[PDB]
Design an enzyme around this catalytic site. Structure first.
Site, PDB file in Angstrom:
ATOM      1  CB  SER A  36      -1.008   0.007   1.155  1.00 16.65           C
ATOM      2  OG  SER A  36      -0.330   0.236   2.375  1.00 16.65           O
ATOM      3  CG  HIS A  63      -0.641   2.475   7.688  1.00 22.20           C
ATOM      4  ND1 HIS A  63       0.561   1.869   7.996  1.00 22.20           N
ATOM      5  CD2 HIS A  63      -1.582   1.845   8.430  1.00 22.20           C
ATOM      6  CE1 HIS A  63       0.354   0.917   8.890  1.00 22.20           C
ATOM      7  NE2 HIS A  63      -0.938   0.880   9.166  1.00 22.20           N
TER       8      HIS A  63
HETATM    9  P1  LIG Z   1      -0.522  -0.958   3.456  1.00 20.79           P
HETATM   10  O1  LIG Z   1      -0.519  -2.398   2.859  1.00 20.79           O
HETATM   11  O2  LIG Z   1       0.562  -0.728   4.607  1.00 20.79           O
HETATM   12  C1  LIG Z   1       1.893  -0.479   4.331  1.00 20.79           C
HETATM   13  C2  LIG Z   1       2.793  -1.244   5.275  1.00 20.79           C
HETATM   14  C3  LIG Z   1       2.193   0.967   4.227  1.00 20.79           C
HETATM   15  C4  LIG Z   1      -2.210  -0.461   4.016  1.00 20.79           C
HETATM   16  C5  LIG Z   1      -2.151   0.281   5.382  1.00 20.79           C
HETATM   17  N1  LIG Z   1      -3.161  -1.534   4.176  1.00 20.79           N
HETATM   18  C6  LIG Z   1      -4.209  -1.581   3.102  1.00 20.79           C
HETATM   19  O3  LIG Z   1      -4.269  -0.810   2.129  1.00 20.79           O
HETATM   20  O4  LIG Z   1      -5.134  -2.552   3.236  1.00 20.79           O
HETATM   21  C7  LIG Z   1      -6.194  -2.720   2.305  1.00 20.79           C
HETATM   22  C8  LIG Z   1      -7.334  -3.423   2.960  1.00 20.79           C
HETATM   23  C9  LIG Z   1      -7.079  -4.196   4.088  1.00 20.79           C
HETATM   24  C10 LIG Z   1      -8.114  -4.862   4.708  1.00 20.79           C
HETATM   25  C11 LIG Z   1      -9.431  -4.743   4.194  1.00 20.79           C
HETATM   26  C12 LIG Z   1      -9.680  -3.979   3.071  1.00 20.79           C
HETATM   27  C13 LIG Z   1      -8.642  -3.308   2.448  1.00 20.79           C
END
Ligand SMILES: *[P@@](=O)(OC(C)C)[C@H](C)NC(=O)OCc1ccccc1
Length: 179
Positions: free
Chosen positions: A110, A163
């Site tokens: 992300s 994030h």
């Molecule tokens: P990303 O993967 O984090 C990094 C380490 C910066 C972010 C915070 N997480 C993300 O985008 O998750 C998407 C999601 C997760 C659970 C349910 C729906 C969508």
């Protein structure tokens, strides 16, 4: 179809995701996470491989959905190399920020996705002639995605606005490239 870089990143996240189901998360983190001990500091892949790890189904789907679209957009119109460099920089810099706030135990694409959001948008509004832009409706959904990250609405973490560090990375690059 989607270029080789877009494609390969998708395969790698899936393969890694498979490994996490078989071996469990901790075991794969052991090999791919940001260095969590001084003896691991020279294992260079770790400064990047954190982006290949996802912790739920929704985590990988939504990341790869955005990646497929924005990553593919950059690769088709700007070239494989551009996507590569956006990816390396955002993974490393977001990785670095994540580590300072949440420690070395983190994962997900992300940071890169936020960078691609910032990049594509900013590049489009400052260099329409480049061929890249984020459509009106997508801007809205990306904004909601960003807000979600700032406020930990993903159900996953609670390590805050860090994030979305990648977004600053992507904007900055789009600036620099619009010169
Ligand atoms: P990303 O993967 O984090 C990094 C380490 C910066 C972010 C915070 N997480 C993300 O985008 O998750 C998407 C999601 C997760 C659970 C349910 C729906 C969508």
């Amino acid at each position: 179809r989607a270029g080789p870089v877009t494609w390969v990143m998708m395969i790698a996240c899936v393969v890694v995701f498979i490994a996490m189901q078989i071996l469990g998360d901790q075991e794969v983190m052991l090999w791919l996470a940001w260095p969590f001990d001084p003896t691991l500091k020279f294992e260079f892949w770790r400064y990047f491989t954190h982006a290949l790890m996802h912790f739920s189904l929704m985590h990988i789907l939504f990341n790869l959905l955005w990646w497929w679209y924005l990553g593919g957009a950059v690769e088709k119109r700007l070239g494989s190399g551009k996507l590569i460099v956006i990816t390396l920089i955002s993974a490393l810099l977001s990785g670095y920020v994540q580590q300072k706030f949440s420690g070395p135990w983190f994962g997900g694409l992300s940071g890169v996705v936020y960078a691609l959001m910032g990049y594509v948008w900013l590049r489009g509004e400052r260099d329409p002639q480049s061929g890249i832009y984020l459509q009106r409706g997508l801007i809205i959904f990306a904004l909601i995605w960003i807000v979600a990250g700032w406020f930990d609405l993903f159900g996953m973490s609670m390590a805050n606005g860090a994030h979305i560090a990648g977004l600053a990375v992507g904007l900055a690059m789009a600036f620099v490239d619009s010169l």
